[PDB]
């Protein structure tokens, strides 16, 4: 059946998502979404609930129209926050709908949005200062502005080290000058290429 291939893809898509294979989760869940019978909106919506965070982790943000169309406006402020690098808004938006997200089974996956939100925040700092040697204290200012409690220079280094290790940021920390030295060629790769 087409209904059974759709159900199969739905579940292996969820498996992949929970194993942090987001490219594969995207393949399976996209397929399920697209081949789901146009008539069953309830089915399409359930799939979208999983496909959404997976898309977002790969740098594809949903339109507010999509979210309206399937009554998933719970994702709207989260999407806006992630897109901006607005950690403070992300935290609030996640809390506001904590129960829904948990009942959807995607709460922990949504937590992974903090990683790319950090990435987006730091990219904005780079775009605003327009230099390839960025003082670590500038990132600290951004994180204080986002009200990360107790944050200090050591924490900025730890966050940057994780982003560099994962491939989100192309550069290295020079401790003599407390600078982040980033590549002159596009130091913030598209999120779909970091996977």
């Amino acid at each position: 059946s087409t209904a059974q291939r759709v159900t199969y893809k739905y579940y292996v898509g969820r498996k992949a998502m929970f194993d942090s294979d987001f490219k594969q989760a995207e393949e399976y869940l996209s397929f399920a979404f697209e081949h789901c019978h146009r008539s069953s909106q309830k089915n399409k919506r359930m799939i979208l609930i999983y496909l959404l965070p997976v898309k977002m982790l790969l740098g594809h943000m949903p339109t507010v129209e999509l979210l309206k169309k399937y009554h998933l406006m719970q994702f709207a402020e989260v999407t806006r926050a992630v897109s901006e690098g607005n950690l403070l808004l992300l935290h609030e938006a996640l809390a506001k709908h904590e129960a829904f997200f948990i009942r959807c089974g995607i709460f922990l996956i949504l937590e992974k949005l903090k990683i790319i939100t950090y990435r987006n925040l730091f990219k904005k700092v780079y775009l605003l200062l327009k230099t390839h040697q960025l003082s670590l204290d500038a990132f600290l200012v951004a994180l204080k502005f986002m009200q990360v409690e107790d944050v200090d220079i050591d924490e900025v280094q730890c966050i940057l080290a994780n982003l560099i290790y994962m491939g989100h940021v192309k550069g290295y920390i020079s401790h003599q000058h407390q600078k982040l030295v980033v590549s002159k060629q596009n130091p913030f790769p598209p999120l779909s290429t970091v996977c």
């Binding site: 898309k55 901006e84 605003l128 500038a138 200012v141 951004a142």
Partner: peptide, 30 residues
């Protein structure tokens, strides 16, 4: 349905402006 253009190199939005003010407030300008 899906947007990628959010991740261009444009900083004309409200949040960007607020962060720009905060940075300048601490001594950081381009």
């Amino acid at each position: 349905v899906w947007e990628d253009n959010w991740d261009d190199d444009n900083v004309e939005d409200d949040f960007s402006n607020q962060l720009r003010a905060e940075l300048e407030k601490h001594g950081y300008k381009m």
